[PDB]
Amino acid sequence: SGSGLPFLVQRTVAREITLLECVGKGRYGEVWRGSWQGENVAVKIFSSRDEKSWFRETELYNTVMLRHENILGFIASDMTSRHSSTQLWLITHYHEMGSLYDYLQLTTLDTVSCLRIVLSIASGLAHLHIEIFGTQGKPAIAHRDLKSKNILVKKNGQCCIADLGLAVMHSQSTNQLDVGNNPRVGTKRYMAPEVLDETIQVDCFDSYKRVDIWAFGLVLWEVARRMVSNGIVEDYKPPFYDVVPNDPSFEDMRKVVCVDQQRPNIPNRWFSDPTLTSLAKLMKECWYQNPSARLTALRIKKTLTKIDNSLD
Numbered sequence: 001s002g003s004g005l006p007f008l009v010q011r012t013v014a015r016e017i018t019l020l021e022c023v024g025k026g027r028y029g030e031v032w033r034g035s036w037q038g039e040n041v042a043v044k045i046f047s048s049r050d051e052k053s054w055f056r057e058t059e060l061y062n063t064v065m066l067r068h069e070n071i072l073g074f075i076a077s078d079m080t081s082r083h084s085s086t087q088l089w090l091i092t093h094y095h096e097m098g099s100l101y102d103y104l105q106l107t108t109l110d111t112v113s114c115l116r117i118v119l120s121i122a123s124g125l126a127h128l129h130i131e132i133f134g135t136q137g138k139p140a141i142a143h144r145d146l147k148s149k150n151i152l153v154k155k156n157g158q159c160c161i162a163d164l165g166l167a168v169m170h171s172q173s174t175n176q177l178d179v180g181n182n183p184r185v186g187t188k189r190y191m192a193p194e195v196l197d198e199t200i201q202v203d204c205f206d207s208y209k210r211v212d213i214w215a216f217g218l219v220l221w222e223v224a225r226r227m228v229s230n231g232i233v234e235d236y237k238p239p240f241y242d243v244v245p246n247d248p249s250f251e252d253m254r255k256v257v258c259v260d261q262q263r264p265n266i267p268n269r270w271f272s273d274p275t276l277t278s279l280a281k282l283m284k285e286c287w288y289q290n291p292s293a294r295l296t297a298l299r300i301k302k303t304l305t306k307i308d309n310s311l312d
C-alpha cells in the first residue's frame with residue numbers, strides 16, 4: 001500500500017541494505033549511498049532533533065499514492081535499535097548527480113538544460129499541489145521547505161523534489177486541512193514575507209501552496225543565473241547572498257524581506273535572451289508580497305511548457 005513496497009517487505013529490504021558511503025551529514029541527520037542486491041539506494045538516518053519529520057514523511061508516502069518522475073521515489077521506511085539507541089531510516093532511489101545546489105556549483109547550463117530543470121520541478125510541484133479523486137488519487141500537498149538542496153538531479157537532466165517531512169495535506173472531500181505537528185520550520189533564507197511577519201493564514205491550505213511558489217521563484221533565480229547566453233553567465237549564489245550571512249536568522253531575513261522589501265536582483269544581460277526574459281517575468285510573479293497574487297504551480301508548468309515549445 002502507498003507509494004513503495006508492502007509494509008513487511010519494507011522491513012526486509014531495510015535490514016538487508018548495506019551502507020556504502022556517506023554523502024551528507026548535518027544537524028538533521030545523515031544521507032548515505034547504500035546497496036540492496038547490487039542496486040544503489042539512498043538511505044537517510046534522522047537525527048533526534050528531527051524525528052517528527054520521519055513520522056510525517058513515512059505516514060505520507062505509505063497512506064498516499066505518490067508516484068511521479070519529479071518526486072523522489074520512496075522505497076521503504078524502518079525503525080531499528082542499533083546499539084543503546086534507536087534509528088529512523090528513509091530509503092529512496094539514489095541520484096548520483098546529487099542535489100541541484102551541488103550541481104549548479106559545478107556546471108553551467110544551456111537553454112534546453114535550464115528549461116528541462118525548471119520544467120521538471122514545476123511538474124513535480126504541480127503534481128503535489130493538485131488533488132486527484134477516485135481511489136487511485138491523492139490529496140493536495142504543499143511542501144513547505146522547497147529549496148535547491150531539496151531538489152535532486154536525475155541522470156536524464158530532469159529533477160525530483162525531496163523531503164516531505166513538513167508537508168501539509170488537503171482534500172475537497174472535507175475541505176479539511178491536515179497540518180500534523182512538527183516544530184520544524186522552513187529554511188529561513190527561503191521563508192516567504194507572510195511567514196516572516198506572521199500574517200500567514202494558517203487555517204487556509206492555499207497559504208501553504210503560495211509559500212511554495214515564493215520558494216520556487218527563488219530556485220528559478222538560482223538556476224537561471226547559471227544559463228549561458230552570449231558567452232556570459234553568473235557564479236552560483238544562494239538567494240539573498242549579498243545582504244544576509246551564511247545561516248541567517250529569522251530577524252535578519254524579516255529585515256531584508258519585509259522591512260526593506262528586498263528581492264533578488266535580475267541581471268541585466270538576461271534581457272538579451274528570450275528565455276531568461278520570460279523566466280525573470282515568472283520570478284516576479286512568484287515574488288508578490290500579497291500571497292494571493294502569486295501564480296499557481298499549474299500556471300507555471302503551462303508557462304514553462306510554452307517557453308519550451310518556442311525553442312528553435
Ligand SMILES: COc1cc(-c2cc(-c3cccc(O)c3)cnc2N)cc(OC)c1OC
Pocket residue numbers: 023024031042043044072090091092093094095096097098099102149150151152162163164
Ligand atoms: C535532500 O533530501 C534527500 C536527498 C537524498 C538523496 C541525496 C543524494 C545525494 C547524493 C550525493 C550528493 C548529494 O548532494 C545528494 C542522492 N540521492 C538521494 N535520494 C536522499 C534522501 O532520503 C533518503 C533525502 O531526504 C529526504
